[PDB]
Design an enzyme around this catalytic site. Sequence first.
Site, PDB file in Angstrom:
ATOM      1  NE  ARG A  60     -35.727  -4.870  33.884  1.00 54.76           N
ATOM      2  CZ  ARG A  60     -35.785  -6.021  34.550  1.00 54.76           C
ATOM      3  NH1 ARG A  60     -34.679  -6.565  35.066  1.00 54.76           N
ATOM      4  NH2 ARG A  60     -36.954  -6.650  34.668  1.00 54.76           N
ATOM      5  CG  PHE A  88     -26.676  -6.569  32.127  1.00 55.75           C
ATOM      6  CD1 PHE A  88     -25.729  -5.614  32.461  1.00 55.75           C
ATOM      7  CD2 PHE A  88     -26.771  -7.705  32.927  1.00 55.75           C
ATOM      8  CE1 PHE A  88     -24.898  -5.777  33.560  1.00 55.75           C
ATOM      9  CE2 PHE A  88     -25.936  -7.867  34.033  1.00 55.75           C
ATOM     10  CZ  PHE A  88     -25.009  -6.902  34.340  1.00 55.75           C
ATOM     11  CG  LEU A 107     -24.157  -5.002  38.634  1.00 58.43           C
ATOM     12  CD1 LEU A 107     -24.534  -5.003  37.170  1.00 58.43           C
ATOM     13  CD2 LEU A 107     -25.304  -5.538  39.474  1.00 58.43           C
ATOM     14  CD  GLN A 135     -32.261  -7.665  32.078  1.00 62.41           C
ATOM     15  OE1 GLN A 135     -32.038  -6.867  32.983  1.00 62.41           O
ATOM     16  NE2 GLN A 135     -33.032  -8.738  32.249  1.00 62.41           N
ATOM     17  CG  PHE A 174     -27.981   0.474  35.241  1.00 60.29           C
ATOM     18  CD1 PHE A 174     -26.733  -0.093  35.475  1.00 60.29           C
ATOM     19  CD2 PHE A 174     -29.092  -0.109  35.834  1.00 60.29           C
ATOM     20  CE1 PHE A 174     -26.595  -1.224  36.282  1.00 60.29           C
ATOM     21  CE2 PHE A 174     -28.962  -1.238  36.641  1.00 60.29           C
ATOM     22  CZ  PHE A 174     -27.707  -1.794  36.862  1.00 60.29           C
ATOM     23  CG  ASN A 179     -27.651 -13.559  38.098  1.00 62.07           C
ATOM     24  OD1 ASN A 179     -28.297 -13.116  39.041  1.00 62.07           O
ATOM     25  ND2 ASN A 179     -26.353 -13.351  37.969  1.00 62.07           N
ATOM     26  CG  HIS A 184     -24.953  -9.769  37.464  1.00 62.98           C
ATOM     27  ND1 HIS A 184     -26.145 -10.247  36.974  1.00 62.98           N
ATOM     28  CD2 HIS A 184     -25.248  -9.149  38.628  1.00 62.98           C
ATOM     29  CE1 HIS A 184     -27.122  -9.951  37.815  1.00 62.98           C
ATOM     30  NE2 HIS A 184     -26.599  -9.282  38.831  1.00 62.98           N
TER      31      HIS A 184
END
Lengths: 4, 164
Positions: free
Chosen positions: B54, B112, B121, B62, B59, B101, B125
């Site tokens: 991903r 990531f 976040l 991942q 951003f 997660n 995370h």
Amino acid sequence: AXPF
Amino acid sequence: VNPTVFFDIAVDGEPLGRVSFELFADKVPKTAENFRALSTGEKGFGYKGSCFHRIIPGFMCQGGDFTRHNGTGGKSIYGEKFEDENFILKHTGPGILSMANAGPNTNGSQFFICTAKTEWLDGKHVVFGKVKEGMNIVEAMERFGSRNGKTSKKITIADCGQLE
């Protein structure tokens, strides 16, 4: 969750 | 003392270069050791050969699902999951390495790399490292992603290990  | 591991990135087979991270074992020892051990392959499994499933421009990138390769798998060196160690470190900018997660206390092997400052976040995370060298390789990886994260090409971790 994720992140997406 | 804080370990430094590396990932030799390859897009569809051609090397793109080496990215190295510093793991803050001095603030998140359990989380850092999980990543260190997965990078060396000492427990018998790890990141070598895995892909970034991903990637989202502006951003993060991942990866870490060395089992399902789709963001549904992966497992830690403790068990399929382990609790959120602490939230001492925040998502301050690009280069921050954090745990992906499925909600609280579900850390596995997925991580990531932030390419932007993702403060939304914080407290959700666990941040445990940062890019030491190679930030330009991570930005280059963004060119193979999409708004939703689906990748344009097979971006893999050709090799990995510990430098210090």
